[PDB]
Nucleic acid binder design. Structure first.
Ligand SMILES: [Mg+2]
Ligand SMILES: [Mg+2]
Ligand SMILES: [Mg+2]
Ligand SMILES: [Mg+2]
Ligand SMILES: [Mg+2]
Ligand SMILES: [Mg+2]
Ligand SMILES: [Mg+2]
Ligand SMILES: [Mg+2]
Ligand SMILES: [Mg+2]
Ligand SMILES: [Mg+2]
Ligand SMILES: [Mg+2]
Ligand SMILES: [Mg+2]
Ligand SMILES: [Mg+2]
Ligand SMILES: [Mg+2]
Ligand SMILES: [Mg+2]
Ligand SMILES: [Mg+2]
Ligand SMILES: [Mg+2]
Ligand SMILES: [Mg+2]
Ligand SMILES: [Mg+2]
Ligand SMILES: [Mg+2]
Lengths: 91, 97, 252, 54, 48, 69
RNA sequence: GUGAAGCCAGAGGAAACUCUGGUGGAGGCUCGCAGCGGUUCUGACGUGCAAAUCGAUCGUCAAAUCUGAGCAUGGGGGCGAA
RNA sequence: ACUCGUGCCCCGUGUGGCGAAAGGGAAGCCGGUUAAUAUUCCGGCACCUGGAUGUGGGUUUUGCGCGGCAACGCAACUGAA
RNA sequence: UUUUUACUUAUUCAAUGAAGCGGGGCUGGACUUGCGUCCAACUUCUGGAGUUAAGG
């Protein structure tokens, strides 16, 4: 079944706070409650514990991530840039 | 290399392999392992242990660039595989290089 | 008239920051011989949530160069850091995320966190979630380094100042609406007694410069001079301009 | 406070790091220590043979 | 109560050998769905 | 010419201390032991419940000084 | 009482995602008892039981809910969802 | 370390108090008993902490237990900084 | 006379358990031809261990 047309996870808020605010909250809530594959062990068991803290239930590893996503695009771009600018210094 | 996937598919189709850490260690101990594959995201301690076992067995090691998910998919399974051993390479030439 | 709320806040009392659930301040290691000449290796034991702080903290254990003990430090966690990770702090440390390096040994264009204003101060700049300091340039003869701050300002710090390679974890925390008075209350209940806030125009003349009147109105220009007396500084202090910002701003 | 009145064998298990470690961690420690010392020995011998050969 | 009854019956049948593991698994998923309204319905489905 | 200091911290050196040897006692006569037995025990209690336990339990009830243990 | 995500099964279709039974147990959601409060009777009383109470009727009732003890802020000062 | 207190030798980064009869925290149960107290008295049956030295047991005599593949077990089964 | 920039000891700030600051000289090197100068001091595969010094 579907149980809902568009409100999705944001249906717990009823008719309150306004549609635009409900959509904005839903956008972050979906990613913040989603499950993620562990980079270290490969299991789909990484979940958010605190605002910027993501832990794997299987391999028990904890990593520092984004507020509502495990990795932010800024950090990914910074990692790529760091690798490039470090390799051009090393060799 | 990219050809490792085709070689692995041929080896599984024709020869025989063991998938998993315990079976790989058993093969290395018994000396019937011809080559071992270790996934990139294998834990460092386990990877070093497997490398030491293969040094003892004089068995070649290939460091598969993919994760355990990708290694299992290459082996044609629906589960992950952190490490595996090839006990018999058949029509494939995986042991040539 | 009365002493206004902004004046009362500086007395302390009920406006003191809450500290029970805060375990330790987030600081670098003290600048020592190992960090000055080579590098030292530390192990990340845990990534913890610090109440009142958006960014997570990292507990990192080091060995004492001079004693058999071991020392646990509390760093601001950079995003990508994980438990069981080796981090390296020193002049000769590798240029990887989480390593603490002096700005002299860092190329131009890299971002760092918890940058020291002066070497040995254990971190002052760019220590909030999603924030960082960019290494704009170097002046080796002067022994200094130009950096760009989160606010957009340009600063010059001695090249011996240290920073942690990467971006502070905690991502886009302010990307989701608080959506609820309770959530604002929970946010501030571990920081300070500053919420909720009553508007000055809703007060009486005894309580605030914006005072009373038969309509809720300020009644005089809300921009207040930089050298106004204490008790007068309510509104927009030393405002260069007012109104909606309708374009790019020359200042940065 | 109750641990002060029961005997040591009931308070510990008979192996290295009997209490405070779970055994799997002890095995991991043993294997890791052996591998790091082996790697250190071969690294020092390689550095001596390939950087001090002249 | 219904789910416990159905799973108990499925375990009993698998242990006795009336059903193999594949039929047991598909029947378990059908019973997690709303397919069988009572033990009698499950038994009739199993026999068919 | 200077002694080796293996610690970067300076500690006050330990010096000789002497016990007091006064040339006059501050008090001449030490006080007699206060709260002797004659002050500790005042008188027995002879109420109904006090006399009951003399037979039922082989105990004597006394009124004693308040600061006696 | 309602029944948000997540999950199971079955129907369509070509796709992609549509639909239908269930499961589940979210929400500064809701009816309502105690507690907390105090809308109306502009009721009782109004030299009172009471220097603010009594009755009926009402608001809220799982969280900006109610509350004890310890502690802090002291008079042009404090504290103030004002 | 001496007949005798006072002769030395090591470690050191720290170096106060008050503040909870609802927080933390060593250990007591049942039956009976008075006009009035009782988890406090009486009877029975226990526990904890501290200090002392015994009997048995265990271990060893160039030394500090044994068993189980293992998870661990067994009445102990040396251990300063 | 006025301005600018030099010194450090007055004064001010910061860190630390007030450990390695400043000059050298022994070695290791890599760069250069009236054999002359610059750099450096041994830790980066692994969530192990590192103390109460071995030796001459
Ligand atoms: Mg005033
Ligand atoms: Mg307001
Ligand atoms: Mg008003
Ligand atoms: Mg005024
Ligand atoms: Mg004014
Ligand atoms: Mg208005
Ligand atoms: Mg006007
Ligand atoms: Mg409600
Ligand atoms: Mg009431
Ligand atoms: Mg009235
Ligand atoms: Mg009347
Ligand atoms: Mg009333
Ligand atoms: Mg009526
Ligand atoms: Mg006290
Ligand atoms: Mg208590
Ligand atoms: Mg007793
Ligand atoms: Mg008794
Ligand atoms: Mg005892
Ligand atoms: Mg004996
Ligand atoms: Mg040489």
């Amino acid at each position: 079944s579907k149980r809902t047309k568009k409100v999705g996870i944001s249906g717990k808020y009823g008719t309150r706070y306004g549609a635009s605010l409900r959509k904005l909250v839903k956008k972050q809530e979906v990613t913040q409650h989603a499950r993620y594959t562990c980079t270290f062990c490969g299991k789909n068991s990484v979940r958010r514990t605190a605002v910027g803290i993501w832990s794997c239930k299987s391999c028990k590893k904890t990593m520092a991530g984004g507020a509502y996503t495990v990795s932010t695009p800024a950090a990914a771009a910074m990692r790529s840039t760091l690798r490039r600018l470090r390799e051009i210094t090393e060799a | 290399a990219q050809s490792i996937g085709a070689k692995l598919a041929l080896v599984i189709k024709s020869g025989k392999v063991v998938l998993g850490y315990r079976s790989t260690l058993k093969a290395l101990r018994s000396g019937k392992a011809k080559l071992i594959l270790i996934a990139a995201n294998t834990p460092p301690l386990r990877k070093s242990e497997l490398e030491y076992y293969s040094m003892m067995s004089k068995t070649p090691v290939h460091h598969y660039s993919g994760t355990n998910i990708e290694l299992g998919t290459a082996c044609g399974k629906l589960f992950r595989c952190s490490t595996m051993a090839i006990l018999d390479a058949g029509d494939s030439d995986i042991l040539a290089d | 008239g009365r002493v206004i709320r902004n004046q009362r806040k500086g007395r302390g009392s009920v406006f003191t920051a809450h500290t029970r659930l805060r375990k330790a301040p987030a600081k670098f290691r003290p600048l020592d011989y190992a960090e000055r000449h080579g590098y030292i290796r530390g192990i990340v034991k845990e990534i913890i949530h610090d109440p009142g702080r958006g960014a997570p903290l990292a507990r990192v254990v080091f060995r004492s160069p001079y004693k058999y003990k071991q020392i646990t430090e509390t760093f601001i966690a950079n995003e990508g850091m994980y438990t069981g990770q080796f981090i390296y702090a020193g002049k000769n440390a590798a240029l990887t995320v989480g390593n603490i390096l002096p700005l002299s040994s860092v190329p131009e264009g890299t971002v760092v966190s918890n940058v020291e204003e002066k070497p040995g101060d254990r971190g002052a700049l760019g220590r909030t979630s999603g924030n960082y300091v960019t290494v704009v340039g170097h002046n080796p003869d002067e022994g200094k380094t130009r950096i760009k701050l989160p606010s957009g300002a340009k600063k010059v710090v001695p090249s011996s100042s240290r920073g942690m390679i990467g971006i502070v974890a905690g991502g886009g925390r302010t990307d989701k609406p608080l959506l609820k008075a309770s959530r604002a209350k929970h946010k501030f209940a571990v920081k300070r007694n500053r919420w909720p806030k009553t508007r000055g125009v809703a007060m009486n003349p005894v309580d605030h410069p914006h005072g009373g009147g038969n309509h809720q109105h300020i009644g005089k220009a809300s921009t207040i001079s930089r050298y106004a007396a204490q008790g007068q500084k309510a509104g927009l202090i030393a405002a260069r301009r007012t109104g909606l910002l309708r374009g790019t701003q020359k200042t940065k | 406070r109750e641990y002060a009145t029961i005997s040591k064998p009931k308070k510990t298990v008979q192996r290295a790091y009997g209490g405070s470690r779970c055994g799997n961690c002890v095995r991991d420690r043993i294997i890791r220590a052996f591998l790091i010392e082996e790697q250190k020995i071969v690294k020092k011998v390689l550095k001596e043979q390939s950087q001090a050969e002249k | 109560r219904r789910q416990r009854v159905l799973r108990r019956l499925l375990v009993k049948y698998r242990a006795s050998g009336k059903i193999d593991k594949h039929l047991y698994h598909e029947l378990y998923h059908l019973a997690k769905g709303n397919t069988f309204k009572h033990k009698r319905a499950l038994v009739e489905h199993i026999h068919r | 010419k200077t002694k080796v200091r293996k610690s970067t911290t300076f500690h006050r050196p330990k010096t000789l201390v002497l016990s007091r040897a006064p040339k006059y006692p501050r008090k001449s006569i030490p006080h007699e032991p206060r709260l002797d037995e004659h002050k500790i025990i005042i008188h027995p209690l002879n109420t109904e419940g006090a006399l009951k336990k003399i037979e039922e339990q082989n105990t004597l009830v006394f009124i004693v000084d308040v600061k006696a243990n």
